[PDB]
Curated annotation (Swiss-Prot):
This is Protein sel-1 homolog 1. Plays a role in the endoplasmic reticulum quality control (ERQC) system also called ER-associated degradation (ERAD) involved in ubiquitin-dependent degradation of misfolded endoplasmic reticulum proteins. Enhances SYVN1 stability. Plays a role in LPL maturation and secretion. Required for normal differentiation of the pancreas epithelium, and for normal exocrine function and survival of pancreatic cells. May play a role in Notch signaling. It is found in: Endoplasmic reticulum membrane. The chain holds residues 115 to 198 of 790 of the full protein. Homodimer and homooligomer. May form a complex with ERLEC1, HSPA5, OS9, and SYVN1. Interacts with FOXRED2 and EDEM1. Interacts with LPL and LMF1; may stabilize the complex formed by LPL and LMF1 and thereby promote the export of LPL dimers. Component of the HRD1 complex, which comprises at least SYNV1/HRD1, DERL1/2, FAM8A1, HERPUD1/HERP, OS9, SEL1L and UBE2J1. SYNV1 assembles with SEL1L and FAM8A1 through its transmembrane domains, but interaction with its cytoplasmic domain is required to confer stability to FAM8A1 and enhance recruitment of HERPUD1. The interaction with SYNV1/HRD1 is direct. It comes from Mus musculus (Mouse). Disruption phenotype: Taxomifen-inducible gene disruption in adult mice leads to premature death within 3 weeks after the onset of taxomifen treatment. Mice progressively loose weight and become moribund despite increased food intake and normal blood glucose levels, suggesting nutrient maladsorption. After eight days of treatment, the pancreas was diffusely dark red and soft, suggesting severe pancreas atrophy. Still, the endocrine parts of the pancreas were not affected. Highly expressed in pancreas, white adipose tissue, liver and spleen (at protein level). Detected in heart, brain, spleen, lung, liver, kidney and testis. Disulfide bonds join C9-C35, C23-C50. The lineage of its organism: Eukaryota, Metazoa, Chordata, Craniata, Vertebrata. Belongs to the sel-1 family.
């Protein structure tokens, strides 16, 4: 399942053997309020920020753009056809 950025997480989650009923910044130095979409954060390692998640959207857009770019580059380096 990976990491759940930009997903709901209102339900309290277990973190360092301590349940939190709201957004907390424990475990991070930047102080960002992060949330876990699962009951136990230690096992599934599912967590996400409580903010607007603009960073997550930028990350997803960057990943999609990189995938498109690498596909195009393997297309270009894979053939010398002008239409390719």
């Amino acid at each position: 399942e990976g990491t759940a950025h930009g997903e709901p997480c209102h339900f309290p989650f277990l973190f360092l053997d301590k349940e939190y009923d709201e957004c907390t910044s424990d475990g991070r130095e930047d102080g960002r309020l992060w949330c876990a979409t699962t009951y136990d954060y230690k096992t599934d390692e599912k967590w996400g920020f409580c903010e607007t998640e603009e960073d997550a959207a930028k990350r997803r857009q960057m990943q999609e753009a990189e995938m498109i770019y690498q596909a195009g580059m393997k297309i270009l380096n894979g053939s010398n056809r002008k239409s390719q």
